[PDB]
Amino acid sequence: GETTDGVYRVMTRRLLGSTQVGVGVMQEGVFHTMWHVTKGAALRSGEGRLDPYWGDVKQDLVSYCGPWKLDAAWDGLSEVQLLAVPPGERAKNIQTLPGIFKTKDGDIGAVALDYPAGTSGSPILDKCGRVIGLYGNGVVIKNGSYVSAITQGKRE
């Protein structure tokens, strides 16, 4: 199927009509998404099949056709862009200054933007257009608003 680098919707026909369950990134022949979008299932791209290659429930990430390729990191100072791909809507860039998730194992950047659950897997980018993580695993804070971690894998 289509192997061109870029952002893709992840769809299913198992529910009513065609439903967008998430989003992912094709880079260097590998498809990258969040684990909760596919649950590790195989994917179709035209007449082609993409098989899972690596995944981890705790990181909430999965790669297909090869190892995780995304290794850019948020610099901790600059604004980033969420390349949001919402269900039934055109891809749109949103610029924001990340906040921080402070954990017992270190700090992670976080983006306070609220999109439908089917937007999970949309990439967060730096000013060079490099993907610094994927949007869609986060928390609901005091005022009821959603904040997503900037989730990034490790390139072996």
Binding site: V7, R44, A91, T96, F101, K104, L125
Partner: protein
């Protein structure tokens, strides 16, 4: 049976809409990959 469909290039866009705050939160990450607020 899940399938993928291209939605665009990955590029920074000049003069994109700018929004969202920058909260600093204490969080915990469990073995199931769920984040929770620590208060």
């Amino acid at each position: 049976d899940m399938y993928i469909e291209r939605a665009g290039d990955i590029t920074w866009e000049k003069d994109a809409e700018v929004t969202g705050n920058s909260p600093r939160l204490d969080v915990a990450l469990d073995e199931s990959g769920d984040f929770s607020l620590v208060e």
